Amino acid sequence: NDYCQHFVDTGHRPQNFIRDELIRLKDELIAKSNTPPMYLQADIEAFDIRELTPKFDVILLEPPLEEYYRKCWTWDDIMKLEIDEIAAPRSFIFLWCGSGEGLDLGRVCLRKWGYRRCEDICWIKTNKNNPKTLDPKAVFQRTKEHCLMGIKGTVDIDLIITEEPEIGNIEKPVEIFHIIEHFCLGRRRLHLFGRDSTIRPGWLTVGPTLTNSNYNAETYASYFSAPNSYLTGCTEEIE
């Protein structure tokens, strides 16, 4: 059966018909390792990023693109972020890119801050509860977003399938956090452009819409002072 034809016929995106412990202790081990959640309201355009210390093992960059809203950041603004200055020598980035120019401009950024792309994670949005308006350049209906993963220095698939959120809901699937956390990449984890609704144990959120802050660089670096500096986030805490 041809689900591309079926979509031309009925409006059901092909992904709608994708079908369908053991790794559960690694979830407890992440949770035991997770630092207290930390959050800081900041206007990142006008905020000297270096103030965020120490260097991060993982950065999750979720800038508010105008394409999400059918204050927005252009790729002009994102590129000029000095991400290289707060990223640990060996470290990872997960960059939400949307589905338009970002799939290219986000790769420019990854190279600009000095990462090589190792993984292209697609969020495929089903429309099971509503069998869209197009971008001028668009050739097909765009039914997914891309989260690019970059590495610098020396269980899970690259897909997240969920139902298209309500128009004007800009949240990305929490599953990205599981994928990231199951990688065991370190505990200094930074979420740039989080919201109140994205604050999470084992993460530092920084964003303009945060209503409360609790960040303290000194308190923050104490979660990683010896003997905890090199943990993966997937091991038992040291006694």
Partner: protein, 201 residues
């Protein structure tokens, strides 16, 4: 001439200028993806040097990428004069509709580049996600010919590095495992005889 046509050859050495202009190009190149080779790869410069620009004036390029070709194909796609404007991903399932480095790969990507100013194309009929069963290895799903047909019906299309199961009405398949030359468009036949009078390329 609507029915299938194909050319066994090496897209490196074939003078693609004889084939005229196409509404859609599709290419499934053997990128050197710094891994072990179960087929002859092309080098990055051989990739860059491919004479894709002569094939179109206004129309669409479809370009399968994987690994570091995701970046490199963006380079070739740009060098050849295309802007990337979409990107299809094919979700690989089995017969029961469940999905088949750092992550396990559940998909293959196909960049969509545009060139010139195409007009009269049915933009927005399909969506950028394919769900289709994996057949052989290195085997693109037939569904993409339907999306390309709806997008630009009746028009001339050309496929690079196709295999023999890929030969479709309205297409000309180029590949090194096809069974000789089979050409029906007379203008093509003419130019082919003119450029290759002794039949060898």
């Amino acid at each position: 001439l609507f029915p299938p046509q194909w050319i066994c050859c090496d897209i490196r050495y074939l003078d693609v200028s004889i084939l005229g202009k196409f509404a859609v190009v599709m290419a499934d190149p053997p990128w050197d993806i710094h891994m072990e080779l179960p087929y002859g790869t092309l080098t990055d410069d051989e990739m860059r040097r491919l004479n894709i620009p002569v094939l179109q004036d206004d129309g669409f390029l479809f370009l399968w990428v994987t690994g570091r070709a995701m970046e490199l194909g963006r380079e070739c796609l740009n060098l050849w004069g295309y802007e990337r404007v979409d990107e299809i991903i094919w979700v690989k399932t089995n017969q029961l509709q469940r999905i088949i480095h750092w992550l396990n790969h559940g998909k293959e990507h196909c960049l969509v580049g545009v060139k010139g100013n195409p007009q009269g194309f049915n933009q927005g009929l399909d969506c950028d996600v394919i769900v289709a069963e994996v057949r052989s290895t290195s085997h693109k799903p037939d569904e993409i010919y339907g999306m390309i047909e709806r997008l630009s019906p009746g028009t001339r299309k050309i496929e690079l590095f196709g295999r023999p199961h890929n030969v479709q009405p309205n297409w000309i398949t180029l590949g090194n495992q096809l069974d000789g030359i089979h050409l029906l468009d007379p203008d093509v036949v003419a130019r082919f005889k003119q450029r290759y009078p002794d039949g060898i390329i």
